[PDB]
Design an enzyme around this catalytic site. Sequence first.
Site: not given
Ligand SMILES: [Mg+2]
Length: 249
Positions: A11, A41, A151
Amino acid sequence: STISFITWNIDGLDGCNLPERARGVCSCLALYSPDVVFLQEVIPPYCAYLKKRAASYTIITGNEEGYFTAILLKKGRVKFKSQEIIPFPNTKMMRNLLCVNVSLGGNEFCLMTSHLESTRGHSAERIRQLKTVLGKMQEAPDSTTVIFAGDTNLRDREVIKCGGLPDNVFDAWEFLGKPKHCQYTWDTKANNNLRIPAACKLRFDRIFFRAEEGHLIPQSLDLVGLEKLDCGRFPSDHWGLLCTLNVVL
Ligand SMILES: [Mg+2]
Ligand SMILES: N#Cc1ccc2cc3c(=O)[nH]c(=O)nc-3n(-c3cccc(-c4nnn[nH]4)c3)c2c1
């Protein structure tokens, strides 16, 4: 003969407590000491943090526009051979497939990662991207162990809609008998990073492998990053996955 790795959407677009959360992720890398780390990310200051706080990992990247994926290789353990970038021509979120061909413990591998098309609305594109990944896994040379860890943003019967996993490709969580302790990698009830009021539990982070019969198979699969940091938040909105593959003769 063995391989240990972590896959984690860290994230990076979350600007809140980013240095502390990056420290948290680097603490996990130092503790579990995996051979390889698949990250999604990642953002430019996150790379700069990894260069200083996880310096014994070579950071392999493809395109670095906005946010991106990276494959980290433990120096002295993993030998880099080559990299290939497989584009997703219809992506609207700059997504692609990154393969890094390496040598480890006397064995040849093609390590793959991706951050498949996000959001429920782009299900058709995500399914097409999953097909591209699965096709690329099957196309790798026969004597190479193929590992995809990333992911996937997959849910419901999206894998069924893709035509299912091919006969020679397996999901590590499925192979280990779908254990409950690591069944969800994006859990808004257990994880408070996004402050989502509704309880949602999904298995977005997945591991796919293609190995020769009687060679490498998953030994263990565990969630990582479940320890709350000093700020009262977790390193990411996602749990990471720690996996070990071993040869059973
Ligand atoms: Mg994120
Ligand atoms: N906030 C929030 C929030 C709360 C609850 C859910 C529940 C589900 C569910 O049971 N199934 C599912 O497939 N996805 C769910 N998402 C989700 C997760 C990522 C993305 C999008 C999404 N993107 N665009 N529109 N929706 C939805 C949620 C998200």
